[PDB]
Design a protein around this ligand. Structure first.
Ligand SMILES: C[S@@+](CC[C@H](N)C(=O)[O-])C[C@H]1O[C@@H](n2cnc3c(N)ncnc32)[C@H](O)[C@@H]1O
Ligand SMILES: [Zn+2]
Ligand SMILES: [Zn+2]
Ligand SMILES: [Zn+2]
Length: 428
């Protein structure tokens, strides 16, 4: 694809570089999804085939668990829908495959249907994906085996499975190159595989941002890219300090980042901000809170699957109180709990609580992320839609206009999401 090229990136394997300049907001390229799945919770909200968010969604009369825009989207999805239609109804409540198993089954399907290079593989092919097979611990290798067992159990009707456990190779490849599709509010819509998009290496200070216009991945410049510069995306959440960022990257992607931010650690001091207070906190007292903060984060990750919403908020308020003694309110570990608490109030349809948390987050949040960040665009959007809901038309408009500003860069001026937000301002 024009104005870019695949190249050998010293110490980063294969990569994508520019052959022409790209300005802030310019679309480098699009990539139609090679394989994709609409997440189970978004059924009836989005079209299974084109991911269009609409209300007049017609049901699959054969499974009553697949929705479409019309009969053509339904017919166009049947080669992929075939995999789950009858099994969902025949397996009944016993039908529980994870999204990774759902996705991998559609990759195997695509490889049988269309074995030749797809328009999504102009620079990187699915077969050429990096696996990191050789660095997997037994715990990880066992987690892939669960997924393989699950593949065989639910998708054996139409699929012929490959040469021993070269399914381990494929499952390690989808873990390494697999994409999750999120909406305007960064809510999970599904999983997909974008091969050319997967060629891009990581930077904690990227020059590009991946957005989705249905099942189509779009790459837009968030910094100026000049000929010969490598195009880098972020694989992870850029709020956390160097250690946390690299702890996630090493775990999920088996590499350590050495970008300007991870080298310099410049933004680290501000990220884990400490209170100025009479008799400043001791060097060890700081390290003790970081360990607590990082453990309460994981404890919360578990607690959501098995605790009441009023219990979840209690975890948030209690942990914020312990942390507040050492940590300032701008600290990323404090801002996470506030983000968690806002999420709960939103679930409980507590629009005041959600707004009080948003307002408390946004200013310090904006500061901690790059200039064009999907996290802060989404946060400004949540805040705007909350204000607008609570009939605060002035503040709601400021917030929605702030979101539109970041969004016109990453998503593009003509994005369906921008047109939706503009209508929210125009009516109320
Ligand atoms: C989605 S693939 C990117 C394309 C990959 N470089 C290739 O040749 O197939 C992700 C993998 O690329 C490598 N990678 C990406 N960004 C990197 C970086 N900044 N430093 C080192 N390795 C990186 C890691 O091995 C990582 O798991
Ligand atoms: Zn459709
Ligand atoms: Zn069906
Ligand atoms: Zn980095």
């Amino acid at each position: 694809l024009g104005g870019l090229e695949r190249f050998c990136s010293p110490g980063k394997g294969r990569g994508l570089r520019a052959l022409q300049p790209f300005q802030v907001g310019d679309l480098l390229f699009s990539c139609p999804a090679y394989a994709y799945v609409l997440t189970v919770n978004e059924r009836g909200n989005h079209c299974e085939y084109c991911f269009t968010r609409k209300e007049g969604l017609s049901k699959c009369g054969r499974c009553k668990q697949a929705f479409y825009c019309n009969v053509e989207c339904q017919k166009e999805d049947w080669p992929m829908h075939k995999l789950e239609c009858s099994p969902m109804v025949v397996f009944g409540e016993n039908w529980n495959p994870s999204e990774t198993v759902r996705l991998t089954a559609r990759i195997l399907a695509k490889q049988k249907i269309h074995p030749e290079r797809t328009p999504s593989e102009k620079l990187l092919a699915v077969k050429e994906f990096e696996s990191h097979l050789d660095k997997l611990d037994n715990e990880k290798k066992d987690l892939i085996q669960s997924d393989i067992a699950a593949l065989h159990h639910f998708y054996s009707k139409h699929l012929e499975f490959p040469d021993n456990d070269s399914l381990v190779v494929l499952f390690a490849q989808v873990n390494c190159n697999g994409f999750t599709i999120e909406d305007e509010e960064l809510s999970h819509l599904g999983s997909a595989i974008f091969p050319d998009v997967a060629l891009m290496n990581h930077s904690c200070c990227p020059n590009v941002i991946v957005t989705y216009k249905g099942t189509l991945a779009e790459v837009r410049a968030v910094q100026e890219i000049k000929p010969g510069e490598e195009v880098f995306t972020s694989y992870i959440d850029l709020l956390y300090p160097t250690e946390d960022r690299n702890d996630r990257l090493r775990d999920s992607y088996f590499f350590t980042c050495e970008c300007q931010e991870c080298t310099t650690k410049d933004k680290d001091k501000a990220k884990v901000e400490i209170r100025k207070l009479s008799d400043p906190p001791k060097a060890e007292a700081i390290r003790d809170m970081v360990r607590y903060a990082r453990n309460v984060i994981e404890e919360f990750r578990r607690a959501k699957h098995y605790k009441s919403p009023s219990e979840l908020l209690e975890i948030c308020e209690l942990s914020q109180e312990k942390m507040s003694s050492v940590f300032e309110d701008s600290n990323v570990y404090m801002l996470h709990m506030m983000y968690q608490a806002m999420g709960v109030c939103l679930y409980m349809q507590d629009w005041e609580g959600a707004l009080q948390y948003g307002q408390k987050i946004i200013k310090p949040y904006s500061k901690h992320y790059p200039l064009y960040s999907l996290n802060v665009a989404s946060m400004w959007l949540k805040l705007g839609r909350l204000y607008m809901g609570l009939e605060h038309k002035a503040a709601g408009e400021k917030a929605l206009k702030k979101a539109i500003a970041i969004m016109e860069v990453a998503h593009g001026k003509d994005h369906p999401y921008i047109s939706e937000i503009k209508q929210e301002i125009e009516s109320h």
